[PDB]
Write an enzyme that holds these catalytic residues in place. Structure first.
Site, PDB file in Angstrom:
ATOM      1  CB  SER A 189     -20.552  25.150  24.194  1.00 40.22           C
ATOM      2  OG  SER A 189     -19.637  24.902  25.239  1.00 40.22           O
ATOM      3  CB  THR A 206     -16.210  20.531  22.659  1.00 42.10           C
ATOM      4  OG1 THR A 206     -16.117  21.211  21.403  1.00 42.10           O
ATOM      5  CG2 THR A 206     -15.254  19.347  22.702  1.00 42.10           C
ATOM      6  CG  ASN A 215     -18.114  27.216  30.187  1.00 43.35           C
ATOM      7  OD1 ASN A 215     -19.060  26.958  29.453  1.00 43.35           O
ATOM      8  ND2 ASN A 215     -17.027  26.471  30.212  1.00 43.35           N
ATOM      9  CB  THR A 232     -18.265  24.933  18.522  1.00 44.49           C
ATOM     10  OG1 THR A 232     -17.972  25.955  19.472  1.00 44.49           O
ATOM     11  CG2 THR A 232     -17.666  25.218  17.153  1.00 44.49           C
ATOM     12  CB  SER A 281     -17.579  28.489  23.877  1.00 45.83           C
ATOM     13  OG  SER A 281     -18.597  27.540  23.765  1.00 45.83           O
ATOM     14  CD  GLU A 310     -22.399  21.647  37.660  1.00 45.35           C
ATOM     15  OE1 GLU A 310     -22.872  22.617  36.992  1.00 45.35           O
ATOM     16  OE2 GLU A 310     -21.579  21.808  38.593  1.00 45.35           O
TER      17      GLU A 310
HETATM   18  C1  LIG Z   1     -16.605  25.897  26.428  1.00 47.14           C
HETATM   19  C2  LIG Z   1     -15.641  24.753  26.057  1.00 47.14           C
HETATM   20  C3  LIG Z   1     -15.144  24.505  24.682  1.00 47.14           C
HETATM   21  C4  LIG Z   1     -15.523  25.360  23.426  1.00 47.14           C
HETATM   22  P1  LIG Z   1     -16.928  24.554  22.650  1.00 47.14           P
HETATM   23  O1  LIG Z   1     -17.751  23.806  23.718  1.00 47.14           O
HETATM   24  O2  LIG Z   1     -17.814  25.644  22.059  1.00 47.14           O
HETATM   25  O3  LIG Z   1     -16.507  23.738  21.427  1.00 47.14           O
HETATM   26  C5  LIG Z   1     -14.211  23.343  24.436  1.00 47.14           C
HETATM   27  C6  LIG Z   1     -13.749  23.140  23.160  1.00 47.14           C
HETATM   28  C7  LIG Z   1     -12.866  22.046  22.957  1.00 47.14           C
HETATM   29  C8  LIG Z   1     -12.521  21.270  24.072  1.00 47.14           C
HETATM   30 BR1  LIG Z   1     -11.331  19.730  23.871  1.00 47.14          BR
HETATM   31  C9  LIG Z   1     -12.974  21.487  25.357  1.00 47.14           C
HETATM   32  C10 LIG Z   1     -13.821  22.526  25.548  1.00 47.14           C
HETATM   33  N1  LIG Z   1     -14.302  22.780  26.945  1.00 47.14           N
HETATM   34  C11 LIG Z   1     -13.890  21.872  28.065  1.00 47.14           C
HETATM   35  C12 LIG Z   1     -14.783  20.599  28.042  1.00 47.14           C
HETATM   36  C13 LIG Z   1     -16.301  20.852  28.467  1.00 47.14           C
HETATM   37  C14 LIG Z   1     -16.225  21.007  29.829  1.00 47.14           C
HETATM   38  C15 LIG Z   1     -14.769  20.359  30.344  1.00 47.14           C
HETATM   39  C16 LIG Z   1     -14.255  19.688  29.261  1.00 47.14           C
HETATM   40  C17 LIG Z   1     -15.192  23.884  27.198  1.00 47.14           C
HETATM   41  O4  LIG Z   1     -15.592  24.089  28.297  1.00 47.14           O
END
Ligand SMILES: Cc1c(CP(=O)(O)O)c2ccc(Br)cc2n(CC2CCCC2)c1=O
Length: 269
Positions: A47, A214, A109, A212, A107, A145
């Site tokens: 992200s 993740t 999507n 952030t 964050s 993706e």
């Molecule tokens: C958008 C998003 C976030 C917030 P960031 O990316 O800014 O830290 C997130 C944060 C922690 C976790 Br544990 C899963 C996350 N997910 C799900 C993951 C990425 C795609 C599926 C698993 C987020 O989508």
């Protein structure tokens, strides 16, 4: 003013405990002093690209009067998982400025994908980053993706060093006009998703803005920030992690520990 050696051994021990790779680049904007650790390796953006996306929207707003106030309507089929603001405005739509804030501070999507569409997709955001002198950044795919974080895959990566260099240009340098620059800073300052990362290493009396990332796999997560210590110039830093196995877990504690070591290396008390 390579202070990389004050903290090279502690970074190696932190990475050994974590069980993967940690990438750090930190810049003292006063002296130009830096701390590097795997600073030129590629890590998945996850992200974290959404901050650069909001900055690219702000850059376009300098050319296109009214862009930020434009209402955007979207269907249910635009709502991908983790769209906590955009799902609340499905029946109403949101402005470009609101999608940009949601992308940065939650964050969001769906908001990120809608703004990517406005810019011409991943190639358009890559184009904006080339336009500010970043030759490392690449975005290739859309949410979700781009989160695959496949070992060795350069798609949807950058380096900690290029992320810090671009972040400094956008937040503190001349890449955005002053109003757009302050709006980008204010969006990063209002981020809600980073309290356990760089922010966990920063005293309560210092200002910080962060984004952030993740990916959810391969121990891959990250954060970048501008930090304004009292009484000295701002610090810009990027902390990225990955790990070799798909079911390796990321660690927010490891990112905060890495940020602590970077600041200790720069001599920021
Ligand atoms: C958008 C998003 C976030 C917030 P960031 O990316 O800014 O830290 C997130 C944060 C922690 C976790 Br544990 C899963 C996350 N997910 C799900 C993951 C990425 C795609 C599926 C698993 C987020 O989508």
């Amino acid at each position: 003013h390579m202070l990389t050696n004050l903290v090279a051994e502690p970074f190696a021990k932190l990475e050994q405990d974590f069980g993967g790779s940690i990438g750090v680049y930190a810049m003292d904007t006063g002296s130009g002093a830096t701390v590097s650790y795997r600073a030129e390796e590629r890590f998945p953006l996850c992200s974290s690209f959404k901050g650069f996306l909001a900055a690219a929207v702000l850059a376009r707003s300098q050319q296109q009067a009214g862009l930020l106030d434009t209402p955007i309507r979207y269907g249910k089929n635009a709502l991908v998982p983790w769209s906590p603001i955009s799902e609340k405005y499905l029946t109403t739509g949101m402005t470009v400025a609101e999608l940009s804030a949601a992308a940065v501070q939650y964050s969001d999507n769906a908001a990120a994908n809608l703004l990517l569409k406005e810019l011409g997709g991943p190639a358009g955001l890559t184009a904006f980053m080339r336009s500010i002198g970043d030759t490392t950044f690449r975005l290739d795919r859309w949410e979700l993706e781009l989160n695959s974080a496949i070992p060795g895959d350069a798609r949807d990566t950058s380096s900690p060093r290029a992320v810090t260099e671009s972040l400094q240009k956008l937040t503190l340098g001349s890449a955005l006009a002053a109003p757009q620059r302050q709006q980008f800073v204010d969006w990063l300052k209002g981020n809600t998703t980073g309290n356990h990362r760089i922010r966990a290493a920063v005293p309560a009396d210092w200002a910080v803005g962060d984004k952030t990332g993740t990916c959810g796999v391969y121990g891959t997560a990250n954060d970048y920030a501008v930090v304004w210590p009292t009484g000295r110039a701002p610090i810009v830093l990027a902390v990225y992690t990955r790990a070799p196995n798909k079911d390796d877990k990321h660690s927010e504690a490891v990112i905060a520990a890495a940020a602590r070591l970077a600041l200790e290396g720069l001599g920021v008390n």
